[PDB]
Design a protein around this nucleic acid. Structure first.
Lengths: 62, 57
DNA sequence: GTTTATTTTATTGGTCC
DNA sequence: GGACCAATAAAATACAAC
Protein backbone atom coordinates (compact mmCIF):
# COMPACT_ATOMS: atom_id res chain seq x y z
CA UNK A 1 0.00 0.00 0.00
CA UNK A 2 1.81 3.12 1.39
CA UNK A 3 2.58 5.35 -1.70
CA UNK A 4 1.31 8.61 -0.04
CA UNK A 5 -0.79 10.38 -2.75
CA UNK A 6 0.70 13.57 -4.31
CA UNK A 7 -2.01 16.55 -5.75
CA UNK A 8 -0.86 17.20 -9.36
CA UNK A 9 0.13 20.66 -10.65
CA UNK A 10 -2.54 22.93 -12.17
CA UNK A 11 -0.34 23.20 -15.25
CA UNK A 12 -0.09 19.41 -15.57
CA UNK A 13 -3.79 18.93 -14.73
CA UNK A 14 -4.75 21.45 -17.43
CA UNK A 15 -2.68 19.63 -20.08
CA UNK A 16 -4.17 16.36 -18.78
CA UNK A 17 -7.73 17.65 -19.22
CA UNK A 18 -6.78 19.21 -22.61
CA UNK A 19 -5.85 15.83 -24.14
CA UNK A 20 -8.67 13.95 -22.38
CA UNK A 21 -11.07 16.24 -24.23
CA UNK A 22 -9.41 15.09 -27.47
CA UNK A 23 -9.62 11.36 -26.59
CA UNK A 24 -11.18 9.55 -23.60
CA UNK A 25 -8.74 6.67 -24.33
CA UNK A 26 -4.99 7.34 -24.78
CA UNK A 27 -2.61 5.86 -27.39
CA UNK A 28 0.66 4.27 -26.21
CA UNK A 29 2.43 6.96 -28.24
CA UNK A 30 0.59 10.06 -26.95
CA UNK A 31 1.18 8.80 -23.39
CA UNK A 32 4.94 9.03 -24.00
CA UNK A 33 4.44 12.50 -25.41
CA UNK A 34 2.12 13.60 -22.58
CA UNK A 35 4.36 12.23 -19.80
CA UNK A 36 7.61 13.89 -20.92
CA UNK A 37 5.59 17.07 -21.51
CA UNK A 38 4.36 16.95 -17.88
CA UNK A 39 7.16 15.01 -16.09
CA UNK A 40 4.88 12.20 -14.91
CA UNK A 41 4.85 8.40 -15.15
CA UNK A 42 3.20 6.72 -18.14
CA UNK A 43 1.75 4.45 -15.46
CA UNK A 44 0.63 7.59 -13.65
CA UNK A 45 -0.92 9.07 -16.82
CA UNK A 46 -2.69 5.76 -17.56
CA UNK A 47 -3.95 5.92 -13.98
CA UNK A 48 -5.24 9.46 -14.56
CA UNK A 49 -7.28 8.53 -17.64
CA UNK A 50 -8.09 5.26 -15.88
CA UNK A 51 -9.60 7.45 -13.11
CA UNK A 52 -10.74 10.41 -15.25
CA UNK A 53 -13.02 7.91 -17.10
CA UNK A 54 -14.87 7.13 -13.84
CA UNK A 55 -15.38 10.87 -13.14
CA UNK A 56 -17.32 11.35 -16.42
CA UNK A 57 -19.44 8.29 -15.63
CA UNK A 58 -20.34 9.95 -12.29
CA UNK A 59 -21.65 12.98 -14.21
CA UNK A 60 -24.58 10.61 -14.91
CA UNK A 61 -25.93 12.43 -11.82
CA UNK A 62 -26.76 15.31 -14.24
CA UNK B 1 -27.60 17.19 8.89
CA UNK B 2 -26.11 15.27 12.41
CA UNK B 3 -26.12 11.50 13.10
CA UNK B 4 -27.97 10.25 16.24
CA UNK B 5 -26.11 9.99 19.57
CA UNK B 6 -27.37 6.41 19.85
CA UNK B 7 -26.23 5.80 16.26
CA UNK B 8 -22.88 7.43 17.13
CA UNK B 9 -22.40 5.14 20.14
CA UNK B 10 -23.27 2.23 17.81
CA UNK B 11 -20.48 3.25 15.38
CA UNK B 12 -17.65 3.73 17.90
CA UNK B 13 -18.91 0.48 19.44
CA UNK B 14 -17.88 -1.39 16.26
CA UNK B 15 -14.94 0.96 15.52
CA UNK B 16 -13.27 -0.16 18.75
CA UNK B 17 -14.22 -3.64 17.45
CA UNK B 18 -12.21 -3.02 14.25
CA UNK B 19 -10.79 0.11 12.54
CA UNK B 20 -11.68 -1.32 9.10
CA UNK B 21 -15.06 -3.01 8.51
CA UNK B 22 -16.23 -6.17 6.69
CA UNK B 23 -19.12 -5.87 4.20
CA UNK B 24 -20.92 -8.39 6.42
CA UNK B 25 -20.71 -5.86 9.26
CA UNK B 26 -21.66 -2.79 7.15
CA UNK B 27 -24.98 -4.60 6.60
CA UNK B 28 -26.16 -5.15 10.15
CA UNK B 29 -24.61 -1.75 10.98
CA UNK B 30 -26.34 0.18 8.12
CA UNK B 31 -29.69 -1.56 8.60
CA UNK B 32 -29.17 -1.66 12.39
CA UNK B 33 -29.15 2.17 12.27
CA UNK B 34 -31.00 2.70 8.94
CA UNK B 35 -28.08 4.48 7.23
CA UNK B 36 -26.24 4.26 3.92
CA UNK B 37 -23.33 1.86 3.39
CA UNK B 38 -21.68 4.84 1.66
CA UNK B 39 -22.39 6.87 4.81
CA UNK B 40 -21.28 4.10 7.20
CA UNK B 41 -18.27 3.56 4.93
CA UNK B 42 -17.65 7.33 4.95
CA UNK B 43 -17.88 7.63 8.75
CA UNK B 44 -15.22 4.95 9.28
CA UNK B 45 -13.09 6.58 6.57
CA UNK B 46 -13.25 9.93 8.40
CA UNK B 47 -13.17 8.12 11.75
CA UNK B 48 -9.62 6.83 11.05
CA UNK B 49 -8.49 10.42 10.33
CA UNK B 50 -9.70 11.44 13.80
CA UNK B 51 -7.53 8.73 15.42
CA UNK B 52 -4.57 10.11 13.50
CA UNK B 53 -5.41 13.41 15.25
CA UNK B 54 -5.35 12.02 18.80
CA UNK B 55 -3.83 14.88 20.87
CA UNK B 56 -4.00 13.31 24.38
CA UNK B 57 -7.81 12.93 23.94
C1' DG C 1 -13.26 29.44 14.41
C1' DT C 2 -14.01 24.21 15.31
C1' DT C 3 -16.44 19.75 14.32
C1' DT C 4 -20.43 14.84 7.00
C1' DA C 5 -19.71 14.28 2.45
C1' DT C 6 -17.24 14.93 -2.12
C1' DT C 7 -12.99 14.73 -5.19
C1' DT C 8 -8.44 13.15 -6.39
C1' DT C 9 -4.19 10.05 -6.44
C1' DA C 10 -3.31 5.27 -6.29
C1' DT C 11 -3.04 0.21 -5.81
C1' DT C 12 -5.59 -4.48 -6.24
C1' DG C 13 -7.63 -7.84 -8.17
C1' DG C 14 -11.02 -9.39 -11.81
C1' DT C 15 -11.68 -9.70 -16.92
C1' DC C 16 -10.88 -9.85 -22.10
C1' DC C 17 -8.15 -9.92 -26.31
C1' DG D 1 1.39 -8.72 -21.62
C1' DG D 2 -1.32 -4.79 -22.04
C1' DA D 3 -5.72 -2.73 -21.88
C1' DC D 4 -9.84 -2.05 -19.59
C1' DC D 5 -13.37 -2.11 -15.63
C1' DA D 6 -14.91 -1.64 -10.43
C1' DA D 7 -13.92 -1.67 -5.22
C1' DT D 8 -11.50 0.59 -2.11
C1' DA D 9 -8.43 3.35 0.63
C1' DA D 10 -6.03 7.76 2.07
C1' DA D 11 -5.02 12.81 1.44
C1' DA D 12 -7.00 16.95 0.31
C1' DT D 13 -11.07 19.79 0.00
C1' DA D 14 -15.42 21.76 0.80
C1' DC D 15 -19.43 23.21 3.07
C1' DA D 16 -23.08 23.10 6.95
C1' DA D 17 -23.99 23.57 11.43
C1' DC D 18 -22.94 25.02 15.76
Amino acid sequence: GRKKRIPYSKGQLRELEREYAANKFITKDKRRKISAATSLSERQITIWFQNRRVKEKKVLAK
